[PDB]
A paper describes a structure:
PERVs belong to the γ-retrovirus genus of porcine type C oncoviruses. Retroviral envelope GPs belong to the class I viral fusion protein family, which includes HIV-1 gp160, coronavirus spike S, and influenza hemagglutinins, among others. Each protomer is composed of two subunits, a surface protein (SU) that harbors receptor binding activity and a transmembrane protein (TM) that facilitates membrane fusion. A triggering event results in a conformational change required for membrane fusion.
A construct that included the residues 493 to 587, encompassing the heptad repeat region 1 (HR1), the CX6CC chain reversal (CR) region, and HR2, was generated. The third cysteine in the CX6CC motif was mutated to serine (C557S) to prevent nonspecific disulfide formation from an unpaired cysteine. The purified PERV TM ectodomain was crystallized, and its structure was determined by molecular replacement to 2.0 Å resolution. Two biological trimers are present in the asymmetric unit. The PERV TM structural analysis revealed a canonical class I viral postfusion 6HB. The canonical trimeric 6HB is organized in coiled-coils, with the N-terminal HR1 forming the central trimeric helical core and the C-terminal HR2 packed against it. Asparagine residues (N534) from each protomer point into the inner helical core to coordinate a chloride ion. The PERV TM structure revealed an HR-interrupting stutter corresponding to 506VTED509, visible after the third turn in HR1. The conserved CX6CC motif forms an intramotif disulfide bond between the first and second cysteines. Thermal denaturation experiments revealed that the PERV TM was equally stable at all the tested pHs.
Numbering used by the authors:
A (entry chain C): 491 to 587
B (entry chain A): 491 to 582
C (entry chain B): 492 to 580
Write the structure that this text describes.
């Protein structure tokens, strides 16, 4: 029935939106955590550079190529903020369905 | 075509479910890795506080405000556990 | 319900857009996290050097060593196959 199918479509939309919201929220929590941890790590490394000051710093002291952090904070937060906008609007829309 | 639309709804449901499960598994893997890394980092920091014991610890020695780790593990694990339950219970 | 076909393809399109945003973000998180783990293990090699005669960092602390749990390969493959499906779609 057409009205039956309308309700199934609305119901599918409602439940997929809820699952996408759970993922957006979790991805944004991971970004916040990971960025905060990167600040802890680079502060730890500033401490190591001071302890190794005589030897030219941590990476020189170890005689190794210096590893560096790859920061995607801006891109993830922009992407997830636009996703939140879409999901929140779709969520209020389907409260009527 | 009403019958075909019904199969269409079910087909879309199946396909989205498989993609949501892929993201759920990867989010959960990322959370396990990130949480394990935070314990490594904090252990490294305890070692640095030992090395800077006479200067009052790492952050005093550097004359900086201490950076703070923001932990969301419980919230991420609960969000994803509930999402796995909904995905599984609707699987028909 | 007369435009159900348009509603269904619309839903498919919207969800595809949202899954693509989540895939890109998960994959960026994976690259950042893996890079941070390399910085952190290099930091710990420095600490093990400073504590060499004590037997390294975790012995000097009198603690069991914490270790990094790596899922890079699994995440990358999962997200590669997802991108493969989403672009086909
Ligand atoms: Cl560290």
């Amino acid at each position: 029935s057409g009205q039956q199918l309308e309700k199934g479509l609305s119901n599918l939309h409602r439940i997929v939106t809820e699952d996408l919201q759970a993922l957006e929220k979790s991805v944004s929590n991971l970004e916040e955590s990971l960025t905060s941890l990167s600040e802890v790590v680079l502060q730890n490394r500033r401490g190591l550079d001071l302890l190794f000051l005589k030897e030219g710093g941590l990476c020189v002291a170890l005689k190794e190529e210096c590893s560096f952090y790859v920061d995607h904070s801006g891109a993830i937060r922009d992407s997830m903020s636009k996703l939140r906008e879409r999901l929140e609007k779709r969520h209020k829309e389907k409260e009527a369905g």
